[PDB]
Amino acid sequence: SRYRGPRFKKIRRLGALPGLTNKRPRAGSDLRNQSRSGKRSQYRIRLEEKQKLRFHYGITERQLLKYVRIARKAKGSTGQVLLQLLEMRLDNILFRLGMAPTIPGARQLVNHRHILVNGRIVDIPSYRCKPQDTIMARDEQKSIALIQNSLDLSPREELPKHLTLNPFPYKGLVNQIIDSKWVGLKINELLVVEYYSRQ
Amino acid sequence: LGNDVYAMDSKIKKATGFGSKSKKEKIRDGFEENVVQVRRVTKVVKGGKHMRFRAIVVVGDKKGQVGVGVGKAKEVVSAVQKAAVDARRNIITVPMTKYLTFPHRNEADYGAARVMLRPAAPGTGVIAGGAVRTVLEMAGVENALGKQLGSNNALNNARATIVAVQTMRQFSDVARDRGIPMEELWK
Amino acid sequence: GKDTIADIITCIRNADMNRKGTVRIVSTNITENIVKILLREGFIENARKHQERNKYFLVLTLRHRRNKKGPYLNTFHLKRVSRPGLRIYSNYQRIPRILGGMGIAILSTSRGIMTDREARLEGIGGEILCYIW
Amino acid sequence: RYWNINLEEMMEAGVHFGHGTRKWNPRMSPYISAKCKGIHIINLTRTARFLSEACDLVFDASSRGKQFLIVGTKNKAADSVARAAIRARCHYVNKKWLGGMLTNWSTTETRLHKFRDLRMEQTAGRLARLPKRDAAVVKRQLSHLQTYLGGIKYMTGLPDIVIIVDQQEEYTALRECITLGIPTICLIDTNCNPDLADISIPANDDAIASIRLILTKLVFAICEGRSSYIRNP
RNA sequence: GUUAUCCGGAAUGAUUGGGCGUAAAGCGUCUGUAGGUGGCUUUUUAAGUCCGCCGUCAAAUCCCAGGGCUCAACCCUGGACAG
Ligand SMILES: [Mg+2]
Ligand SMILES: [Mg+2]
Ligand SMILES: [Mg+2]
Numbered sequence: 160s161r162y163r164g165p166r167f168k169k170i171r172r173l174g175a176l177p178g179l180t181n182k183r184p185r186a187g188s189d190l191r192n193q194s195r196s197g198k199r200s201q202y203r204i205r206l207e208e209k210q211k212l213r214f215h216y217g218i219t220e221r222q223l224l225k226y227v228r229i230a231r232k233a234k235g236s237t238g239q240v241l242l243q244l245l246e247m248r249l250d251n252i253l254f255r256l257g258m259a260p261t262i263p264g265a266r267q268l269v270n271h272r273h274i275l276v277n278g279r280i281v282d283i284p285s286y287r288c289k290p291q292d293t294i295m296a297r298d299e300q301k302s303i304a305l306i307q308n309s310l311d312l313s314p315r316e317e318l319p320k321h322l323t324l325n326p327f328p329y330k331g332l333v334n335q336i337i338d339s340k341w342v343g344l345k346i347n348e349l350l351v352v353e354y355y356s357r358q
Numbered sequence: 359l360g361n362d363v364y365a366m367d368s369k370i371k372k373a374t375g376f377g378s379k380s381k382k383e384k385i386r387d388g389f390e391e392n393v394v395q396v397r398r399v400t401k402v403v404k405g406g407k408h409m410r411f412r413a414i415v416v417v418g419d420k421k422g423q424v425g426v427g428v429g430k431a432k433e434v435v436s437a438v439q440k441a442a443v444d445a446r447r448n449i450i451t452v453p454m455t456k457y458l459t460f461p462h463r464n465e466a467d468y469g470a471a472r473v474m475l476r477p478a479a480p481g482t483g484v485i486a487g488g489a490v491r492t493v494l495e496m497a498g499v500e501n502a503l504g505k506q507l508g509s510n511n512a513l514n515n516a517r518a519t520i521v522a523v524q525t526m527r528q529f530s531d532v533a534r535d536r537g538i539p540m541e542e543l544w545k
Numbered sequence: 546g547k548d549t550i551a552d553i554i555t556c557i558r559n560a561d562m563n564r565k566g567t568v569r570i571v572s573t574n575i576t577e578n579i580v581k582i583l584l585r586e587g588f589i590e591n592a593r594k595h596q597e598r599n600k601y602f603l604v605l606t607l608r609h610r611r612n613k614k615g616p617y618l619n620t621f622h623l624k625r626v627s628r629p630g631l632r633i634y635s636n637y638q639r640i641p642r643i644l645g646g647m648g649i650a651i652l653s654t655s656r657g658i659m660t661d662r663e664a665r666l667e668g669i670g671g672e673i674l675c676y677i678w
Numbered sequence: 679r680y681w682n683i684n685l686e687e688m689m690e691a692g693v694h695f696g697h698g699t700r701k702w703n704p705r706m707s708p709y710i711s712a713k714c715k716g717i718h719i720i721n722l723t724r725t726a727r728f729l730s731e732a733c734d735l736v737f738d739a740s741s742r743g744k745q746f747l748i749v750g751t752k753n754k755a756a757d758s759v760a761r762a763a764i765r766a767r768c769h770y771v772n773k774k775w776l777g778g779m780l781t782n783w784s785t786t787e788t789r790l791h792k793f794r795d796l797r798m799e800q801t802a803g804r805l806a807r808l809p810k811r812d813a814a815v816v817k818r819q820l821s822h823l824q825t826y827l828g829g830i831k832y833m834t835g836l837p838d839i840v841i842i843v844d845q846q847e848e849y850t851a852l853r854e855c856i857t858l859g860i861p862t863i864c865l866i867d868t869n870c871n872p873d874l875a876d877i878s879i880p881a882n883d884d885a886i887a888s889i890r891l892i893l894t895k896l897v898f899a900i901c902e903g904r905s906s907y908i909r910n911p
Numbered sequence: 912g913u914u915a916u917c918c919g920g921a922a923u924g925a926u927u928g929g930g931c932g933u934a935a936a937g938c939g940u941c942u943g944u945a946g947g948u949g950g951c952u953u954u955u956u957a958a959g960u961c962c963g964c965c966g967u968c969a970a971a972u973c974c975c976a977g978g979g980c981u982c983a984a985c986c987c988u989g990g991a992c993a994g
């Protein structure tokens with residue numbers, strides 16, 4: 160139920176995908192055969208957008224679909240609510256807090272019971288995080304070592320204003336609900352919403 | 359009076375030859391053309407089948423300005439181009455709301471093409487079929503419901519869409535027509 | 546003349562589409578009230594009454610041509626709703642509103658004729674005579 | 679600014695009458711006036727307001743620096759047009775009017791290019807060095823090109839104000855300006871529809887006198903507007 | 912994935928939402944019974960119609976707001992538009 164396949168590859172075809180890979184793609188070397196499909200059918204544009212989303216967060220389709228139903232339900236602007244929902248996933252928050260290298264990494268971190276949300280172990284990636292929530296490492300040697308090395312050796316200080324990080328114990332804190340401008344990717348949710356008119 | 363030869367050679371040098379001056383200026387007009395349909399229509403002659411290409415193309419800025427045009431030639435390329443040029447001289451403006459959608463619900467009729475547009479909440483995107491959707495999208499309408507009832511001809515549906523969004527009245531104007539303040543009609 | 550209301554409406558629609566400012570209609574409590582209302586909404590220039598051989602005629606002046614007769618962006622639409630065949634009524638929470646409120650809906654209610662606006666203020670439903678664009 | 683018109687002069691030149699009552703367009707019934715002996719009589723109080731607004735827009739247009747065409751192709755109006763244009767120093771069409779003069783500009787203007795070469799040829803006297811067939815041929819080209827290009831032969835670029843006589847016969851002028859985004863200021867008799875012109879002046883068709891009156895008032899406005907644009911640029 | 916079943920798309924049985932000169936479609940033409948609809952003005956009544964209040968339309972389900980199984984599915988509490 161997880162994408163274990165070649166990553167660079169999906170990246171060449173989709174675009175830039177942070178939650179997947181930090182290695183910038185090869186020059187692309189397709190300039191020999193110069194093979195194109197011509198251009199893309201409007202359908203293919205829509206499809207590639209959705210795929211962008213899906214692989215950035217490591218979600219399965221059947222899951223994405225149910226997020227979208229939750230989205231159409233919710234009273235509000237649909238694409239926005241969707242992006243909220245996807246961006247509140249525990250593993251993704253674990254990632255954007257620099258507590259992980261990438262999303263498969265963060266996911267693994269959560270799975271192996273190395274993380275705590277308000278003094279309780281949550282081992283499932285898709286646990287939805289709500290405002291005022293404590294993201295901690297379990298107090299064991301291993302957990303702490305992991306989080307420390309992956310947090311410190313990665314310099315990025317981009318923290319998106321709803322996310323606090325605190326230094327020695329390493330208490331991360333979820334402050335509030337995401338803003339559409341603070342979202343974790345370049346995507347027109349409009350296209351995805353459109354793709355999903357038929358479900 | 360200056361001499362006839364140098365002034366007529368001035369209007370001759372200012373109207374430039376079409377055999378010494380190549381053509382690409384079009385991205386300077388701030389537009390984008392979208393080929394909706396390419397078909398091979400045929401005239402028939404004693405020799406045989408004489409093949410032409412019809413192009414149905416719509417132009418917009420994606421900023422609230424759109425038009426349709428149709429063209430015919432031997433090669434895809436030239437048809438496409440004439441289509442562009444024709445649309446550019448047929449063009450109109452679509453009334454928009456602060457959220458990028460339609461003022462109101464509207465139908466439209468052209469030939470056997472009937473068209474129904476109604477405004478949508480922001481965040482629903484543009485959901486429609488081929489002609490209607492490319493025209494809408496190229497106008498820059500962000501959120502709209504549309505369905506074409508009646509026929510399916512790509513072309514008549516394009517025209518129809520245009521007649522729809524042409525007859526769209528914006529509130530300031532109905533307030534100007536009726537002679538009544540805005541806040542009164544809002545209620 | 547099976548329906549009188551529909552007929553007034555029609556005389557307008559027709560005289561309108563033919564670019565005439567002046568219409569003769571036959572008066573009635575209903576007719577008169579509807580036209581009054583049409584004036585206070587502002588869809589029509591001016592009304593007046595005439596009498597001959599015990600017949601009453603409301604002549605209606607109509608909004609002038611739109612910056613010529615050939616180039617008209619706007620027409621003035623009318624549509625019958627409750628008609629002798631099927632009478633349509635609505636409670637307070639189904640009261641129609643036309644093109645987000647740009648147009649108007651005429652209602653006959655217990656308090657007399659009005660628009661949908663009035664019906665919402667006073668909290669009343671009733672029989673829906675017609676719509677106007 | 680004021681213009682020269684009074685009920686007495688309009689009476690004098692004979693503007694107020696128009697074609698028989700079997701020939702009429704009821705489209706003009708809104709502003710017609712009376713009907714006498716099977717001949718229609720048109721409102722002059724409407725005629726004066728239209729003629730004033732016509733001369734006023736003509737004045738603003740000349741003063742800003744815009745360019746003028748005039749058109750009528752009748753036999754008498756053609757003789758009055760060459761002189762109207764010369765007195766106002768404008769462009770004219772009197773002789774046979776060619777479909778496409780306005781709308782199809784590109785080809786029209788190439789036809790102007792070759793007309794200019796013909797005009798240099800003729801005055802150079804290099805038409806004396808030819809066979810007789812060549813000279814009579816070059817002279818066909820000349821005869822035509824004079825009929826068609828004579829009054830416009832100065833104008834380069836698209837004309838943005840067009841004036842016209844008797845829109846009944848002139849259908850294509852009206853069509854082409856309708857198409858190209860050009861104003862028409864036009865003479866209406868009892869037979870013509872007031873759709874086709876931007877400003878349409880109730881007027882007379884059959885009378886050389888009416889043509890002379892209204893065209894002279896108009897060319898006087900073009901001339902005073904010509905002094906004001908000779909001043910402003 | 913394939914097959915079966917049902918609704919959709921189908922405005923293709925159409926109240927919302929189609930048609931009948933030539934495309935499927937106006938009885939060969941009238942007279943007329945039931946039935947449907949029917950001009951204007953005042954009054955009455957209040958059957959429709961409208962507004963308020965009450966009773967009920969079991970619980971579960973669907974919808975909204977919280978809570979519990981680490982999450983979700985699922986369970987539990989409270990409440991309500993329709994009609
Ligand atoms: Mg599964
Ligand atoms: Mg594979
Ligand atoms: Mg477990």
Ligand SMILES: [Mg+2]
Nearest residue numbers: 356357358919
């Ligand atoms: Mg669906």
Ligand SMILES: [Mg+2]
Nearest residue numbers: 467469470508
């Ligand atoms: Mg039709």
Ligand SMILES: [Mg+2]
Nearest residue numbers: 506507508509
């Ligand atoms: Mg369809």
Ligand SMILES: [Mg+2]
Nearest residue numbers: 634635636994
């Ligand atoms: Mg009811």
Ligand SMILES: [Mg+2]
Nearest residue numbers: 921922923925
């Ligand atoms: Mg159906």
Ligand SMILES: [Mg+2]
Nearest residue numbers: 925926928929
């Ligand atoms: Mg029906």
Ligand SMILES: [Mg+2]
Nearest residue numbers: 922923929930
């Ligand atoms: Mg059918």
Ligand SMILES: [Mg+2]
Nearest residue numbers: 933934935936
């Ligand atoms: Mg047959």
Ligand SMILES: [Mg+2]
Nearest residue numbers: 933934935936
């Ligand atoms: Mg048949």
Ligand SMILES: [Mg+2]
Nearest residue numbers: 937938939940
């Ligand atoms: Mg028959």
Ligand SMILES: [Mg+2]
Nearest residue numbers: 938939940941
């Ligand atoms: Mg029979």
Ligand SMILES: [Mg+2]
Nearest residue numbers: 941942943944
């Ligand atoms: Mg009978």
Ligand SMILES: [Mg+2]
Nearest residue numbers: 944945946947
């Ligand atoms: Mg009977």
Ligand SMILES: [Mg+2]
Nearest residue numbers: 629947948949
């Ligand atoms: Mg009865």
Ligand SMILES: [Mg+2]
Nearest residue numbers: 547549950951
């Ligand atoms: Mg009655």
Ligand SMILES: [Mg+2]
Nearest residue numbers: 969970971972
């Ligand atoms: Mg129940």
